[PDB]
Amino acid sequence: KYKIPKNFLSGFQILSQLDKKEIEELAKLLGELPVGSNVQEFQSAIQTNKELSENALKSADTIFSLGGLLLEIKADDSLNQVAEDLTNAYAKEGEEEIGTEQREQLIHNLLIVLQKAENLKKTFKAYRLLFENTRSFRKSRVMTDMRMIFDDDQTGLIIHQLKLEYIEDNTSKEFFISLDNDDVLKLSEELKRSLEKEECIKRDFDQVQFINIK
Amino acid sequence: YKIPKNFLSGFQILSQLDKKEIEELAKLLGELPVGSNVQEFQSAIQTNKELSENALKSADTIFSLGGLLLEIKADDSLNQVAEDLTNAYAKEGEEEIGTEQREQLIHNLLIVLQKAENLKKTFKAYRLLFENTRSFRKSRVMTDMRMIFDDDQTGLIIHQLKLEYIEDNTSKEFFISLDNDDVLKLSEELKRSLEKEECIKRDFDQVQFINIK
Amino acid sequence: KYKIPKNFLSGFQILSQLDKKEIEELAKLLGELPVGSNVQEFQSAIQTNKELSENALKSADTIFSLGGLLLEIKADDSLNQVAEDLTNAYAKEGEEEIGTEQREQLIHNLLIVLQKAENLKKTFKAYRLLFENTRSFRKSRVMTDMRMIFDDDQTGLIIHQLKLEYIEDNTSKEFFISLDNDDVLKLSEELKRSLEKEECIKRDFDQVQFINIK
Amino acid sequence: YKIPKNFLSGFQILSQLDKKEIEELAKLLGELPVGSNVQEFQSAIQTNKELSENALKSADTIFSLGGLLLEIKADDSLNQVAEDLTNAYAKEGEEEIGTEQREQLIHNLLIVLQKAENLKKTFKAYRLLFENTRSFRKSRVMTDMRMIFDDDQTGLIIHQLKLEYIEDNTSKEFFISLDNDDVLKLSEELKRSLEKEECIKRDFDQVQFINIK
Amino acid sequence: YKIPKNFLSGFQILSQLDKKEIEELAKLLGELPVGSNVQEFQSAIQTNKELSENALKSADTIFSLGGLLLEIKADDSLNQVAEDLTNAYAKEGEEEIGTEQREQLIHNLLIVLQKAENLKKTFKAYRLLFENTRSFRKSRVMTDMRMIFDDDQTGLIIHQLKLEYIEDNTSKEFFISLDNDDVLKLSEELKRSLEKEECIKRDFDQVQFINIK
Amino acid sequence: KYKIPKNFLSGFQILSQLDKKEIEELAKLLGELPVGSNVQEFQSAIQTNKELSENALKSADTIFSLGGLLLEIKADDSLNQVAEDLTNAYAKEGEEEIGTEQREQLIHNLLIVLQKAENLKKTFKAYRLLFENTRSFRKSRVMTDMRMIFDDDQTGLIIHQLKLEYIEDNTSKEFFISLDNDDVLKLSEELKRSLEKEECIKRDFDQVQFINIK
Amino acid sequence: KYKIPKNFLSGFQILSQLDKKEIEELAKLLGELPVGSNVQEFQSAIQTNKELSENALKSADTIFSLGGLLLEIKADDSLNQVAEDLTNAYAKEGEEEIGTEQREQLIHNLLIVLQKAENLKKTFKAYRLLFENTRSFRKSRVMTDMRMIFDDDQTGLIIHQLKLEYIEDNTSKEFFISLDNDDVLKLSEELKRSLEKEECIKRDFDQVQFINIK
Amino acid sequence: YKIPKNFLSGFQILSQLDKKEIEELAKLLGELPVGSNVQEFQSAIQTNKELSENALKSADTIFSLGGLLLEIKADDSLNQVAEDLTNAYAKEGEEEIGTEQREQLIHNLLIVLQKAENLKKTFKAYRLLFENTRSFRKSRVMTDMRMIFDDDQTGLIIHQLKLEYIEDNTSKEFFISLDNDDVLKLSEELKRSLEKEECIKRDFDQVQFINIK
């Protein structure tokens, strides 16, 4: 069924072994992790909690990666089956064979974590819904070029070549467009107006948690 | 050569001006600085009390001659341009032009065309500024909400930037989706680009960098 | 400044002439007209109000058309200047010359209407913001084709060729895509789910007036 | 000819079957109805208690032969196909194949290929169903809110329909914006298209219209 | 409703026909087989010696009603269509229509529209045949020579196939380069496609497969 | 400088070793090979020449592959440098070290072949110039579909969906277009007319060798 | 059948009236006009022939315009039918009615000209076949821009933005591409090499008349 | 940070250089003028008889550091870059690095990075020269013949210009058809563009305009 990215096998090894106290603090902190939090500030929360070890800290990527799976889980998919399917996949890529005690404790630890992966599921939902668009912005760059006006017996233009890099059809693409100084000003004003509108939409609808991924 | 019927009244008017008024029009067109629009040329005539309302009404037609001066064949005298324009007006006059008016028109267009040097530079700049694969026209941002539905409230604010541009002489739309951080980073790049323009102006201080108006 | 579509000159003629009572009822009804109402149900509201005549009814297109202008009107554009600029444009396309009394009454009547064009301005804003997208849907059609599977010594496919007609870059365009029976079912389910989500978004946010243009 | 290393175990297994098991595999593959997926072929072997787990493990490899049967040169005997496959397996066996196994493999593939007639029809249908300029894969709708900001609350609900399709062997996205009425009218057309399919099935009742699985 | 000024003479003419002529027009339009063009409808009127030249001159206008019958709202009587057309003609008559002619036109259009059933099917086929992403219009092949220049005579013959098509209601060109073998293989596929059409006609023998004309 | 496709190292091994008689027959046959001949009919010519062995036959791909290099060779690129650059590259991918006698004989044999690779260079030139187009045809397929005309109380269309597969921008692409029966006939006539024009262009210009690659 | 561009009705008026001597010289000169000659050098040939009048000179556009029709004329289309169909169309756009004598003389004069329109038919064939391409060049322009390299405590690039204007799908389009100085040099060399190849193709195949339209 | 296995030998080599050799490498890299390619850097090391073959073998790896210097976070010391590179090498050393070599590598990379200022400018120019919507790579012209077939010899010579370019990080082809006059006019514009470049160099004489190599 599942196949585990080879670099996460280290984190499942750790996860089969976390102490029943430590796994509960680690799952507790995961549930406390607010929606939109990236893995590095989940790591930072682990690294500072004096109840969580360096081993828990090293498991953060594996735990956080389950959010990509959690979006598939139906209303009647049981988390026990998920914890076992991940446990059987983990064992199948050993050259050792995983002892039954380690197997049981891993199923339990993953299940305990999956029970608390609620805001993590919302974080992967937010991340995919943010990029469900025809053209998702990634970066911009502006070249500020000079175009000299040649004469028939000292005059010139400055052209702002805006590059937008975007994803469309899962493909990295670039759009170039030519702006004068006044175009750059009026586009800056529309961008400012859209930020002003974002702050208005947050003060209204103040009962919605609006999410930033970065 | 043909004259658009939009401007026939202006060649008529311009054929009717005094040597004093037309000499003042040409000198004023010569002082008009490169990058000046027709509104500033009209404004400058209006404030000169030795140019009439007929001179002011000619100003839009005169400013159009900046374009033709880009198209002329390089061996042509401006006198052949003035004659060709005058016949192209007379051809549109179903009432036949007076011989006095034909002389005055060739004279008046040619005296103007002699000072059209900055008008030519102004139209070169207009051409060269839009000699680009995609030319910006307008921008608009739709600040949309996308709610995150749980299976059993949380949401995204998505900035849908619309860029309107000309390409292949065609008017087109580019939509792209930005979050708050993307909007700041795009704004930060635009500022940095405006700073770069001011640097290229502070260096290269002997080049006049012109803004279209 | 302005130029008036030749067929609306009839409606300005009527509008210069509505009775001070009738113009106030007509502007009152305009302000009562809810956002998203099209001109034909503004006409229908006029046609039924026993205080508004057949002449008011014939003016409805001209009044309703001002909403396209009202989106340009700045915070310090005065409605008097709008009413006069429309009045000077109206007179300039007469072959008669408009008498001063008719001019004054038209400025007043248009201004009285423009003061009540609030939900009409929102209706034109809604209409433009609804079509501010890369591809605005206009129509769909499905061809239900048969593709026979030929054999080497009675079997076939049914292919649902969905056509979407859309506007992009102000251009009328068509997109064809090929669906099997199961694709048509799963797309129908996503469309149903999106309608369910629209009804949820209306019950939440029940303090927002959500607008349909048709 | 080459065998993908994904299926080498299946030719090995299939070379190891009894004449009884392989005769039952071929007959069962012959009864498998057109449009059956490999899951149904596997399921049908599993429930036949005279086919082994080795037979069940061969089923994915056998079902792949439906594709090759579309590519074969029309004068070829299925016996030349079986030999070419057997050499293409032996070429991948760095441990050299037994002569008994070479006979059994050519025999076992050929007995199967003799009954692959509905498997060929099933793969024709798969090809012909995706022989289209744009083939549907998935749909998703984002129900977004677009607030109408007054200069001094009102909003639009916009259904952003995403269609995912294959074109030019490439995976692509088409986004289109719908209002509530557009979504109903599109749904109404889909229903009408499903009704048309049932009519084409009720008429033309002697054609088997197959669904891919 | 509006009438194009191209056809006003035809509604005029058609308003002027006898109950005998108009009954013969409708019956003849009813016998006209699906897929018949206006040339065949004109030809069939011409050879019927009880239809006049005025009937023949009406034929192009009548054939245009096949299109409108695709656009009508399904609850409408054909009598409301005939009235709406008659007012749309009277609206274009700056000389006002006689009341007798208004009755005769509603009568004459409605008697025709009653037999337009195969004309409707003919226009459905026209629509459905061009309800495609790219519709063929024309082909042309340029047989070009490309010489192989040695550094110190040999050449390629390249068949530049041009396909002209409609897409997005726009007229477009597709050029593709073929060698001699590609041209034969493309020709071989077209023949095989024509054979497949004749098979689908020999089977399904109770379906009328219509050609546009 | 060069790097040798690992499967051609076998053919260079053979080529370092062909007998001075056999290499001259093999190069002689290569020069006799007419422009447009593919490797399999070069192989077939080797396989039948009673002076060329099975070893020569196994070298045909390596010899024929030099035509892709021969298009780069300038007016003052010496074939000795080519034969050595290929010989030094061959040795560099051994785990053995190639003996000097084998090195000298390979340089000589390759040089003798390269001196006779004239029509082979024209064959690679022909092959590249044939595909120097915006859209190079690879294959066509026609689906012969039925489109039924539904009615409001037994009529249908047959639509020939022609697929052309082509290369553009080094990318495999497909173009679908819809034809009726008469379109298929008129396109067939234009294709026939273009074949007739090819035969005319060959009878005129009968002093040009016109090349087919397949 | 035909409809005549309103400005060519003047030339048919002249053509109905040319003298039997003059029409034969005018058709004789047309047959002498070499393939690729434009109308202005047909006019120039008329203007200098002392047997052709100013009236013949004014007819040159109408005569030359028949080449666009002549490409449609089949192997069994008779020129008499063409001359009459053009004559009946000419008369139908008079407000006068054309006298029978004028009608007969026009049919004869056009037919006499059409009999000599051979190189004119080749000139319209050449003109259409020259533009039977995916992208027909119309104009180029290069902007020579400066791109300054900014620094972190006097260096720059010159970028040659080549614009090609072309027709594709009957649409006026532009392609911009960015070149450095060396790209401009190497493209110039390929263009020179293609001109050298054109001169070679003319010296070989010296029995073909190679045509330039401009 | 990761090192590509293509360059691991170069960090190894570079970790093994003397303070004398590495000081000469850095100074020489500092004198290398902006726009110099790695071939000229290699050539300049080779001719300096106080740099070894190991120094010459390091040159390709050093020249690659111009790229990383565009990506560094602006607050970073070059010392943190050198450490990060050294750990990224040690991470790829399955045989563990000596502590002496770790010091020498951080030292040797940092002494080089101190003089990489013109290497940074050289890589900026490379980036900025290809920061364009379509970047030229190659051109080719096919001089084709198109014979004019009479119904009962004459021909066109058509110059098929192919431009190869990068767009969207993708390699693409633009074909356009030119006649002899179009080819001359395009050549005339290119010359005029080269003249304009020399003018922009003769004016603006205090700017170094660099050519990529």
Residue numbers in the entry:
A (entry chain A), C (entry chain A), F (entry chain A), G (entry chain A): 22 to 174, 180 to 240
B (entry chain B), D (entry chain B), E (entry chain B), H (entry chain B): 23 to 174, 180 to 240
Article passage:
The ten eukaryotic COMMD proteins are core components of the Commander complex, with central roles in endosomal membrane trafficking and signalling. We find that while CCDC22, CCDC93, DENND10, VPS26C and VPS35L are restricted to the eukaryotic lineage, ancestral COMMD proteins are present in both Bacteria and Archaea. These prokaryotic COMMD-like proteins have very low sequence identity (<20%) to any eukaryotic COMMD family members but share a conserved and highly similar fold including both HN and COMM domains. Our biophysical studies, crystal and cryo-EM structures confirm COMMD-like proteins readily form homooligomeric rings composed of eight or ten subunits assembled from core dimeric building blocks and inter-dimer interactions that are analogous to the heterodecameric core structure of the eukaryotic Commander complex.
We next used Xray crystallography and cryo-EM structure determination to experimentally confirm our predicted structures of these COMMD-like proteins. Crystallisation screens of eight of the selected COMMD-like proteins resulted in successful crystal growth, however most showed poor X-ray diffraction apart from crystals of MBK5214510 from *Flavobacteriaceae bacterium* (**[Fig fig4]; [Table tbls1]; Supplementary Dataset S2**). We were able to solve the crystal structure at 2.6 Å resolution by molecular replacement using the AlphaFold2 model as a template. The asymmetric unit contains a dimer of MBK5214510 that resembles the human homo and heterodimeric structures solved previously (**[Fig fig4]**). As expected, the dimer is formed by the intertwining of the two C-terminal COMM domains, each comprised of three β-strands and one α-helix that creates a large hydrophobic surface buried within the dimer interface. The HN domain contains six α-helices that form a tightly packed globular domain, the orientation with respect to the core COMM domain dimer results in the HN domains been arranged opposite and at 180° from each other (**[Fig fig4]**). Inspection of the crystallographic lattice shows that the MBK5214510 dimer is forming an octameric ring structure along the 4-fold symmetry axis that is the same as the AlphaFold2 predicted octamer (**[Fig fig4]**). Comparisons of the experimental MBK5214510 oligomers to the AlphaFold2 predictions shows that the octameric crystal structure has the closest structural alignment with the predicted octamer (**[Fig figs7]**). Overall, even though there is only an average sequence conservation of less than 13% these results show that bacterial COMMD-like proteins are able to form homomeric rings that are analogous to the eukaryotic heterodecameric complexes, formed by a central ring of interlocked COMM domains that tessellate together and HN domains that extend peripherally.
